[PDB]
Amino acid sequence: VSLSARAAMLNNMDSAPLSNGGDVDLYDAFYQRLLALPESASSETLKDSIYQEMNAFKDPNSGDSAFVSFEQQTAMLQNMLAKVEPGTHLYEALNGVLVGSMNAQSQMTSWMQEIILSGGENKEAIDW
């Protein structure tokens, strides 16, 4: 019932996997979610369909939504407007959701404590 040595080793651990790589994929896919429907030139239905797709794409790279709240929103919207043709109602719907989404985000309560300081800058005596 005796025994002796043999080859018994294949150890390996040099692996370095990853899963990120789809910022392109978000924009182009989303941008195609715009272009699926704007031919109708609808005023309200277009902006609210935009709001839906903006809220529901749900970004692969992170998860929470296609955009963050402000920084990503403002770049995504500025980028969205840079890509579309000014002439279309689509351009106007992106502007309208940018404006409405920004007004919701704005937190003007905090700013009201500073807007109250204003009143004018007339050269009545300073004469700059």
Side-chain angles (χ1 to χ4, degrees), residues 21-33:
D23 183 79
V24 172
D25 186 77
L26 204 196
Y27 268 93
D28 185 71
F30 175 63
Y31 195 62
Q32 286 294 318
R33 295 163 80 143

Side-chain angles (χ1 to χ4, degrees), residues 115-128:
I115 218 65
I116 281 169
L117 187 61
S118 302
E121 206 175 84
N122 185 27
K123 296 192 182 188
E124 192 172 272
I126 191 172
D127 192 39
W128 186 264

Side-chain angles (χ1 to χ4, degrees), residues 39-55:
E39 297 295 278
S40 302
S42 307
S43 50
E44 296 303 319
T45 320
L46 189 56
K47 106 184 197 299
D48 307 332
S49 297
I50 283 177
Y51 278 140
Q52 182 187 269
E53 300 313 289
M54 284 181 15
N55 190 51

Side-chain angles (χ1 to χ4, degrees), residues 9-113:
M9 184 175 68
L10 74 173
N11 181 40
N12 63 94
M13 66 289 181
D14 63 286
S15 303
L18 76 178
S19 301
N20 63 289
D23 183 79
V24 172
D25 186 77
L26 204 196
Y27 268 93
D28 185 71
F30 175 63
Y31 195 62
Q32 286 294 318
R33 295 163 80 143
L34 309 179
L35 271 60
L37 47 72
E39 297 295 278
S40 302
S42 307
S43 50
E44 296 303 319
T45 320
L46 189 56
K47 106 184 197 299
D48 307 332
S49 297
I50 283 177
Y51 278 140
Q52 182 187 269
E53 300 313 289
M54 284 181 15
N55 190 51
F57 196 84
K58 295 310 194 188
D59 170 35
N61 304 278
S62 185
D64 187 72
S65 222
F67 79 74
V68 161
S69 176
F70 184 171
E71 302 97 309
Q72 187 60 85
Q73 190 264 36
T74 272
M76 81 136 301
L77 264 310
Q78 181 60 91
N79 191 24
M80 276 317 126
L81 296 188
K83 289 171 62 66
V84 58
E85 294 297 293
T88 62
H89 205 314
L90 182 67
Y91 156 76
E92 296 189 75
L94 280 307
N95 205 332
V97 309
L98 163 59
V99 160
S101 176
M102 185 62 211
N103 284 347
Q105 192 278 129
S106 70
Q107 198 176 67
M108 283 180 70
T109 41
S110 186
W111 243 96
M112 205 166 286
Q113 319 311 308

